[PDB]
Design a protein around this ligand. Structure first.
Ligand SMILES: [Ca+2]
Length: 221
């Protein structure tokens, strides 16, 4: 059922704001954020150090995005390759409440526990969500169970995490938000029925497939 994370306990969590909070993301170094390609839009301000997104509480850093880079192979219909990089106009000041999260060196396996965090905003969904950061500890599901949950839709660039029993909904992640497992960013909140229906898993972009692209893109921009 998840829980309130606690202010600044997820220091890599970011809010993307274009007048209002519209997506999450993950700080991966002082000047770059990873999010979902379906989060793309103009005039992004990156908000770090947030807990309540409607109240200035004292640990925020607001930094304009200088550049967004959608994956070359992003398909908005299938959500294959749902990943985007956002460069910050200035480097964030890193401390205990604002910190980067490591990229994976290896992919994660079914059964591994992950932390999904966010304010529960699914972009363009029109759905209600809280103003403080929420968290869910959830396991990665097997390939076969993921495909069985979403026949014909799961590519090699996606994985499922969450619960197939319990009779609850999981609405913690924002579009573009982090799935962190054993201190590595393994997933990005992409799509699924995990919030709309009970007993369904979320679907996440499989970050480990993109580490080479992320590193090369950052190194050149
Ligand atoms: Ca705030």
């Amino acid at each position: 059922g998840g829980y309130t994370c606690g202010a600044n306990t997820v220091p890599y969590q970011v809010s993307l704001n274009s007048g209002y909070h519209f997506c999450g993301g993950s700080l991966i170094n002082s000047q770059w954020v990873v999010s979902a390609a379906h989060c793309y839009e103009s005039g992004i301000q990156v908000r770090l150090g947030e807990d309540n997104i409607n109240v200035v509480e004292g640990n925020e850093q607001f930094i304009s995005a200088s550049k967004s880079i959608v994956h070359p192979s992003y398909n908005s219909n299938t959500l294959n390759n749902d990943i985007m990089l956002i460069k910050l106009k200035s480097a964030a000041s890193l401390n205990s409440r604002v910190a980067s999260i490591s990229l994976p060196t290896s992919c994660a396996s079914a059964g591994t526990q992950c932390l999904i965090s966010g304010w529960g905003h699914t972009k363009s969904s029109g759905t209600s969500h809280p103003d403080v950061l929420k968290c869910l500890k959830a396991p990665i599901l097997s390939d076969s169970s993921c495909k069985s949950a979403y026949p014909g839709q799961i590519t090699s660039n996606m994985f499922c995490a969450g619960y197939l029993e319990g009779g609850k909904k999981s609405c913690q992640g924002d579009s573009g938000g982090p799935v962190v497992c054993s201190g590595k960013l393994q997933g990005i909140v992409s799509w699924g029925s995990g919030c709309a229906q009970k007993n369904k898993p979320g679907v996440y972009t499989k970050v480990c497939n993109y580490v080479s692209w992320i590193k090369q893109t950052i190194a050149s921009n």
